[PDB]
Amino acid sequence: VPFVEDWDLVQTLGEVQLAVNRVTEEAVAVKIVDMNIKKEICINKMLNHENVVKFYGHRREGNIQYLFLEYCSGGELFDRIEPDIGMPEPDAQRFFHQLMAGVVYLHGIGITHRDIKPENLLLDERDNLKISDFGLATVFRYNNRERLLNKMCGTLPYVAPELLKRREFHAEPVDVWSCGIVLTAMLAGELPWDQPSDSCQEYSDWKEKKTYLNPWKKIDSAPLALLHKILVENPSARITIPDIKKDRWYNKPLKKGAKRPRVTS
Numbered sequence: 382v383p384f385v386e387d388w389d390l391v392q393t394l395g396e397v398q399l400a401v402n403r404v405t406e407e408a409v410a411v412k413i414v415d416m417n418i419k420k421e422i423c424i425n426k427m428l429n430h431e432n433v434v435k436f437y438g439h440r441r442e443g444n445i446q447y448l449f450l451e452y453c454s455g456g457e458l459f460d461r462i463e464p465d466i467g468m469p470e471p472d473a474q475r476f477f478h479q480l481m482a483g484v485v486y487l488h489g490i491g492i493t494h495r496d497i498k499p500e501n502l503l504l505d506e507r508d509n510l511k512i513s514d515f516g517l518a519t520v521f522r523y524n525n526r527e528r529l530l531n532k533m534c535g536t537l538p539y540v541a542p543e544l545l546k547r548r549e550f551h552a553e554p555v556d557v558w559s560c561g562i563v564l565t566a567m568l569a570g571e572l573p574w575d576q577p578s579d580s581c582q583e584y585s586d587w588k589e590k591k592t593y594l595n596p597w598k599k600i601d602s603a604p605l606a607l608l609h610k611i612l613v614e615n616p617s618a619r620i621t622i623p624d625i626k627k628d629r630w631y632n633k634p635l636k637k638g639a640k641r642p643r644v645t646s
């Protein structure tokens with residue numbers, strides 16, 4: 382079929398550009414990197430999950446690398462969070478379920494994202510969450526042997542406290558922590574602290590169990606009980622994802638199905 386390989390760059394998404402196929406009108410996201418990127422491509426070629434952004438391929442045109450990635454028309458989870466409010470609890474629960482399915486998948490194949498935040502959580506046209514941007518991602522398990530991490534990666538409000546206080550740390554609890562900060566942001570519409578350090582007053586209040594303060598007073602006791610188990614300073618005592626899957630709020634029926642058309646009589 383002639384022209385099937387031509388894509389028009391129609392708009393800047395974030396550089397990330399929206400590409401449309403000349404013939405089929407299929408939309409893809411094209412990440413343009415004008416020369417860490419070789420690691421992003423390698424990690425992307427391993428990924429295949431409904432809650433992880435699809436990788437279609439790559440092309441090197443001199444100093445510029447073009448990455449063909451899934452287009453998610455719903456945009457960023459970030460823009461579904463109302464400041465100081467958040468979002469309805471059933472929506473947050475569904476996005477957290479889909480976040481866990483994605484993270485279970487990544488950890489299962491020995492990959493840690495290292496930068497889970499709402500900006501990197503994208504939504505398709507049906508509002509299905511997809512983990513995106515594997516630029517900071519790395520291999521923490523290979524040939525069934527775990528590699529402890531030591532590089533400081535991520536975004537300060539979402540990083541686990543061990544990443545700031547320890548020389549080495551396990552990868553999986555770091556991603557679990559960041560998922561709990563994402564859950565906080567979805568239910569309160571605010572970030573609890575600038576960084577999880579004892580010098581940060583809000584972080585000290587959380588360790589002092591002062592849940593009568595913001596953001597915790599905006600959060601119902603069932604999801605807050607889950608946050609009490611995720612945002613545990615000791616990474617060895619922190620809840621694991623198999624046990625997040627057994628939490629009472631995680632399994633609480635809250636969300637109705639997708640609206641489906643219906644008539645009467």
Ligand SMILES: N#Cc1cnc(NC(=O)Nc2cc(Cl)ccc2O[C@@H]2CCNC2)cn1
Pocket residue numbers: 394395397410412434450451452453454455456457500501503513514515
């Ligand atoms: N890395 C990466 C990656 C992979 N796929 C992406 N897909 C999109 O569809 N991007 C997107 C779509 C809308 Cl409607 C709005 C913003 C978007 O990307 C944001 C902007 C910055 N990175 C995430 C975006 N970034």
